[PDB]
Amino acid sequence: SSTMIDDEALKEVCEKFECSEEEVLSCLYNRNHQDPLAVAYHLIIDNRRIMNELEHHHHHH
Numbered sequence: 001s002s003t004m005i006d007d008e009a010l011k012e013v014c015e016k017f018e019c020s021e022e023e024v025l026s027c028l029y030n031r032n033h034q035d036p037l038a039v040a041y042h043l044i045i046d047n048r049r050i051m052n053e054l055e056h057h058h059h060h061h
């Protein structure tokens with residue numbers, strides 16, 4: 001199997017939550033969506049996506 005991790009989001013969660021990388025990876029692996037570390041990881045990725053979409057719309061629409 002192959003698992004993809006967003007390294008930048010992982011680093012940001014670890015810095016902001018003062019936690020180990022394995023703590024984040026564990027809740028992702030266990031699909032424990034309710035763990036705030038998982039929520040934060042996906043929030044960082046989702047917001048990056050949304051901001052990229054908004055910037056595009058601002059400049060081109």
Ligand SMILES: [Mg+2]
Binds near residue numbers: 058061
């Ligand atoms: Mg405008």
